[PDB]
């Protein structure tokens, strides 16, 4: 099965999972705010977030790069590598 990977649709599903999280609430959640500083999340907290991305798209995230992923915007750009979106 081939899902249409619209950049806008990618954004929606990314923010969908973050509002599902207990620690962070949609009130202070934004597209441009980062997890660690802006959303005030620990490094261990991050690991769980990336796991949410892991099973959703079903492509493996190596531990070497998982570290540098500290922003939702970074993620929507990273998963754009999976299927190139231009728009």
């Amino acid at each position: 099965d081939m899902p249409p990977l619209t950049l806008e649709g990618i954004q929606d599903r990314v923010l969908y999972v973050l509002k599902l999280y207990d620690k962070i609430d949609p009130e202070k959640l934004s597209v441009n705010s980062h997890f660690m500083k802006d959303l005030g999340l620990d490094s261990l907290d991050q690991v769980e977030i990336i796991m949410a991305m892991e099973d959703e798209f079903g492509f493996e995230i190596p531990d070497i790069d998982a570290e540098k992923l500290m922003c939702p915007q970074e993620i929507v750009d990273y998963i754009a590598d999976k299927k190139d979106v231009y728009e």
């Binding site: 999972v17 599902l20 999280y21 207990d22 769980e48 796991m51 949410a52 099973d55 079903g58």
Partner: protein, 381 residues
């Protein structure tokens, strides 16, 4: 070789076990399947499950047409336990009647519970015929009419069970068993298997991952799970509308589910607080909870470990079905004052809260850490 289960049923000393010995004995001559001695069948192997001890004799006979499995029980109390619990469910049945006795109100219960096991195809055999034989035959057709069968199309075969076993009468004993062999190959010889029914999942565990949502696990018995299906959870006066996101088997994603498999249903946009064990997973509008239910429950004898004192109406046991636990109240049907151990009869038991109960839903009644009854749902009221 299609394989189905078929079991003998009738009054004591109607030559049920002799026929069971005979049907495997004739096949032994041809060498169809392994045969057991009559005396060996007399001694029934013990089966123990869910605090219920049962002496069930299982003999396997393979006819040329199709493969068959056969069940025998020493006692009536043993017979009822088998079919209510449905340890080995039977697609067909053989009703055996003696020439001297024929129908009897005790044998009525056998066919009365046969309505509840979802079997509507029966075979009648007459033994001990060594015009009076033909006199008893017409009542059997009428008897089957009373329960809801049409008596006319039912096969009634004259013979002698002992004659077949000893092989002394080829025209009587032998001709009978082949007729019985042909009758079963005529009535429901092919198994019934379909998954058209909406799926029911009793939730075994509630499992939550942040950034994934609640995963609920259950074993399939009906229906097929598909992704993106709008679904309903109901139980303990909690009913919410949601959608299936993912299905989990061997920690992998799969689109289609199968009966007899433990599947992990992934759900989104819900709280773990609300989702607990005791909930049931079905399609909406399919089923509804039933507070008051009619059911035939077998009350356990003192011998097995059931309570000595018989109970009166407004007794409060513990009801166990699927994954949910609740206590209930038993009102005894009129004309009866008390319900003694070792005797099975229909009740109207009323749950504390409306909880789902459908036809053929097996259950056990309990008092703390003791089992007093096992029953099957006959009607929802």
């Amino acid at each position: 070789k299609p394989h189905v289960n078929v079991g003998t049923i009738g009054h004591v000393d109607h030559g049920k076990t002799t026929l069971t010995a005979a049907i495997t004995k004739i096949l032994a001559e041809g060498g169809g399947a392994k045969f057991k001695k009559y005396e060996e069948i007399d001694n029934a192997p013990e089966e123990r499950a869910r605090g219920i001890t049962i002496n069930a004799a299982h003999v396997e006979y393979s006819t040329a047409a199709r493969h068959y499995a056969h069940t025998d029980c020493p006692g009536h109390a043993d017979y009822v336990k088998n079919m209510i619990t449905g340890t080995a469910p039977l697609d067909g049945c053989i009703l055996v009647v003696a020439a001297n006795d024929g129908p009897m109100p005790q044998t009525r219960e056998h066919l009365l519970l046969a309505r509840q096991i979802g079997v509507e195809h029966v075979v009648v055999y007459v033994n001990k015929a060594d015009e009076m034989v033909e006199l008893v035959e017409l009542e059997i057709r009428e008897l089957l009419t009373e329960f809801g069968y049409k008596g006319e199309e039912t096969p009634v075969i004259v013979g002698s069970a002992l004659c077949a076993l000893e092989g002394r009468d080829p025209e009587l004993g032998l001709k009978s068993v082949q007729k019985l062999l042909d009758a079963v190959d005529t009535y429901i010889p092919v198994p019934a298997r379909d998954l058209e029914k909406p799926f029911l999942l009793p939730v075994e565990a509630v499992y939550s991952v942040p950034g994934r949502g609640t995963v609920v696990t259950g074993t399939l018995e009906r229906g097929i799970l598909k992704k993106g299906d709008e679904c309903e959870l109901l139980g303990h006066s909690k009913n919410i509308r949601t959608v299936v996101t993912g299905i989990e088997m061997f920690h992998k994603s799969l689109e289609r589910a199968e009966a007899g498999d433990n599947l992990g249903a992934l759900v989104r946009g819900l709280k773990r607080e609300d989702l607990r064990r005791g909930l049931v997973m079905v399609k909406p509008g399919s089923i509804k909870p039933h507070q008051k239910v009619e059911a035939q429950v077998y009350i356990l004898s003192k011998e097995e470990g059931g309570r000595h004192k018989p109970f009166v109406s407004h007794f409060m046991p513990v009801m166990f079905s699927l994954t949910w636990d609740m206590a209930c109240r038993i009102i005894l049907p009129p004309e009866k004052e008390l319900a003694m151990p070792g005797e099975d009869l229909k009740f109207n038991l009323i749950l504390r809260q409306p909880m789902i109960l459908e036809k053929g839903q097996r259950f056990t009644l309990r008092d703390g850490n003791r089992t007093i009854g096992t029953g099957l749902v006959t009607n929802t009221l």
